[PDB]
Swiss-Prot record:
Protein family according to the UniProt entry: Belongs to the polysaccharide lyase 8 family.
The species this protein was found in: Streptococcus pneumoniae serotype 4 (strain ATCC BAA-334 / TIGR4)
Record key words, sorted: Cell wall, Lyase, Peptidoglycan-anchor, Secreted, Signal
UniProt-recorded name of the protein: Hyaluronate lyase
BP GO annotations: carbohydrate metabolic process
Topology with respect to the bilayer: Peptidoglycan-anchor
One of the record's GO molecular function terms: hyaluronate lyase activity
Mutagenesis / variant outcome for changing residue 180 to A: Almost complete loss of activity
A single cellular component GO annotation: extracellular region
Range covered out of full length: 287 to 1007 of 1066
Catalytic residues in the record: 180, 230, 239
Protein's cellular compartments: Secreted, Cell wall
EC number per UniProt: 4.2.2.1
Broadest EC class assigned to this enzyme: lyase
Catalytic activity: [hyaluronan](n) = n 3-(4-deoxy-beta-D-gluc-4-enuronosyl)-N-acetyl-D-glucosamine + H2O
Length: 721
């Protein structure tokens, strides 16, 4: 016989593989089956035979490399999936059953057991390998005895005895939080089910419930939608993913144990979806500024990573009811249907996930309406996300401060992310492929768009830093208008700039002042570095006259505008310089390999064409100022820039401000507490960041002091004249 522990493991099997839902007449499901057939075939044809060898697989044979342990066990999990799939050529196959049984024994005696110590990466010993061991035994529980299942999980209890801590067998344990604490549940709740151990189950679930608390310091989800991991890194889009993806798998199982989670406690998940995740999803892409070092992974470009989030959301929708279920279904549906570039099924890796998505997309009762405009100021992780639904573009602003690390270079990944938070911007337009198809290994990492830098050489071996200043932040007025600033100093304290951004509904102004350089390296701001499509070329205009770009840099003194014209208006990009400026532009093929930025990736050469625009800063006290205007045609851009001719109010070392006369909206950044008079209409009085609207005789005010992370009473900061 068997019991309620195995009943839970049946449910787990339906979630992690879903063989009960397989239908050979289902096109998408058959594609995933064929992928698994191929992987099992490959593994079977290379596992080693005769004379108790030095290695199960030759390619994962160095057991001092910890990644080789979990790649090995993951190969056994793939076998367990197919051996229990009635439609697989390996269903109930004698050789496969014995291979998994005997392979677990071989690794157990020579490689991974209680008598061992972590060699290499702890995450493989405590997460990657134990998850793969657990799922294998769960799927194939009808081919193992309880005593063998105990025996092969004993090593999990040696490396991971305590559901509140990772690295327990090291000298320096760590408190389990965030994505890693959900992985604690996928390790210890499943091992606890296999081992029939009620204390492990309950103690692990109790530890997991810490995940539902919003924090105001340290790692976790914040009220304002920010997510921090690795002490002080913006991380919604990699560790946050793992959290929602893993939790949404576990919850249907946890909720049928003897220790279910209170529904009250779980309500915070809906806050994560609406406040943290949704704003970072644009046309099916998860914004790279939230993904940390995972940008350097070829198999995890932004549309692919997005599906980790979407599949989690859809599982949460499925365990919800009524209006909560309906609205989450609609959110997934509209995001997926907006993505003309990536096929969501390419990252749905179980049959239940495929089945859910198919029924969602074909259910006429689930509304799918284009997402409306929004603007999220994630001040607790120094990021801002903006989306305009009318014109159809998104914008991401990637900053850091005294409170956050600029970039994560860890585990030999993201070696050239140096400037990815130095006031870097992202534009999400009709080219859904822009940050994909090898953007990251081919972009020139010295000229990240928006950033002001010197041309000094940088070392791959460097790691991230916090910013000296806390004067970094965004004041949001409404869903369309916000202002941000960053009191910028570069990595070696040779360059400063007061960089500010004025998000004004359908355009963004970029102002920089107080640009100073104490090195002998040259300084410049990259206005853009845009990855091109050979199928959809741009016609380039400078001051409304066609220009011919080349690989070699061409200088354009006295530039008032640049316009990049596509056949598709939703890919158009214009740049309006408030004061005539001296810029340089080039169009060049850039080559590189993923291995250049991540040691674990392929050395295969990749290439893309980029259009680079920059502005040199040869003197102390230099400045820049321009308006980015996307998604309009050439005639409309030319009309808009005439309307904006007097939009620059000030751009100096203490005051930066831009005015949108059409909307009646001002953005203002003050670096001191002087009285600043604006448009002979009003005064602003305090250092900080402002977005202000005039409606009749009335003014709507949004003020933020980024240093104290507080607003202030209207009369302290604003006076109508």
């Amino acid at each position: 016989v068997k019991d309620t522990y195995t009943d839970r493991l049946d449910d787990w099997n339906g979630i992690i593989a879903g063989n009960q839902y397989y239908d050979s007449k289902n096109d998408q499901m058959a594609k995933l089956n064929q992928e698994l057939e191929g992987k099992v075939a490959d593994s079977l044809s290379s596992i080693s035979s005769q004379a108790d060898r030095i290695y199960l697989w030759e390619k994962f044979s160095n057991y001092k490399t910890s990644a080789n342990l979990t790649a090995t066990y993951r190969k056994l999990e793939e076998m367990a999936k197919q051996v229990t799939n009635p439609s697989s050529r390996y269903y109930q196959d004698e050789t496969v059953v014995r291979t998994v049984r005997d392979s677990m024994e071989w690794m157990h005696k020579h490689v991974y057991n209680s008598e061992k110590s972590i060699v290499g990466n702890w995450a493989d010993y405590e997460i990657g390998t134990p998850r793969a061991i657990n799922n294998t035994l769960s799927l194939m529980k009808e081919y193992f005895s309880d005593e063998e299942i105990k025996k092969y999980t004993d090593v999990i209890e040696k490396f991971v005895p305590d559901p509140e801590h990772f690295r327990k067998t090291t000298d320096n344990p760590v408190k389990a939080l965030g994505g890693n604490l959900v992985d604690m549940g996928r390790v210890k709740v499943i091992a606890g089910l296999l081992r029939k151990d009620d204390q492990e189950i309950s103690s692990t679930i109790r530890s997991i419930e810490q995940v539902f608390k919003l924090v105001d310091q340290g790692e976790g989800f914040y009220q304002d939608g920010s997510y921090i991991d690795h002490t002080n890194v913006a991380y919604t889009g990699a560790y946050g993913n793992v959290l929602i993806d893993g939790l949404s798998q576990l919850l249907p199982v946890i909720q049928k144990t003897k220790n279910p989670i209170d529904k009250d406690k779980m309500q915070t998940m809906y806050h994560w979806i609406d406040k943290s995740f949704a704003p970072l999803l644009v046309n099916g892409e998860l914004m790279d500024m939230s993904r940390g070092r995972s940008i350097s992974r070829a198999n995890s470009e932004g549309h692919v990573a997005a599906v980790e989030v979407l599949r989690g959301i859809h599982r949460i929708a499925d365990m919800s009811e009524g209006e909560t279920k309906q609205r989450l279904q609609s959110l997934v549906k509209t995001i997926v249907q907006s993505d003309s570039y990536y096929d969501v099924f390419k990252n749905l890796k179980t049959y239940k996930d495929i089945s859910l998505m198919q029924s969602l997309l074909s259910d006429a009762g689930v509304a799918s309406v284009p997402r409306t405009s929004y603007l999220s100021a994630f001040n607790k992780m120094d990021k801002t996300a903006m989306y305009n639904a009318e014109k159809g573009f998104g914008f991401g602003l990637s900053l850091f401060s005294s409170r956050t690390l600029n970039y994560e270079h860890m585990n030999k990944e993201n070696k050239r992310g140096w400037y990815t938070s130095d006031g870097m911007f992202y534009l999400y337009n009709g080219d859904l492929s822009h940050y994909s198809d090898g953007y990251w290994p081919t972009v020139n990492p010295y000229k990240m768009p928006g950033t002001t830098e010197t041309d000094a050489k940088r070392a791959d071996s460097d790691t991230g830093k916090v910013l000296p200043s806390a004067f970094v932040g965004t004041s949001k007025l409404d869903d369309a208008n916000a202002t941000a600033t960053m009191d910028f100093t570069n990595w070696n304290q040779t360059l400063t700039a007061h960089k500010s951004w004025f998000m004004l509904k359908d355009k963004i102004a970029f102002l920089g002042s107080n640009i100073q350089n104490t090195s002998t390296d040259t300084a410049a701001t990259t206005i853009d570095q845009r990855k091109l499509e050979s199928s959809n070329p741009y016609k380039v205009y400078v001051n409304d006259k066609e220009a011919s770009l080349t690989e070699q840099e061409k200088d354009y003194p006295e530039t008032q505008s640049v316009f990049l014209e596509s056949s598709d208006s939703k890919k158009n990009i214009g740049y309006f310089f408030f004061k005539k400026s001296s810029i340089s532009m080039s169009k060049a093929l850039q080559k590189g390999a993923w291995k250049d930025i991540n040691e674990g990736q392929s050395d295969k050469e990749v290439e893309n064409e980029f259009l680079t625009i920059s502005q040199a800063h040869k003197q102390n006290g230099d400045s820049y100022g321009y308006m980015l205007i996307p998604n309009v045609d050439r005639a409309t851009f030319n009309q808009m820039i005439k309307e904006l001719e007097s939009s620059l109010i000030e751009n100096n070392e203490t005051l930066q401000s831009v005015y949108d006369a059409k909307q009646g909206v001002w953005g203002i950044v003050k670096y001191d507490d002087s009285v600043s008079t604006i448009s002979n209409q009003f005064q602003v009085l305090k250092r900080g960041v402002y977005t202000i609207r005039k409606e009749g005789d009335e003014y709507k005010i949004a003020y933020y002091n980024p240093e104290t992370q507080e607003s202030a009473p209207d009369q302290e900061v604003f006076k109508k004249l």
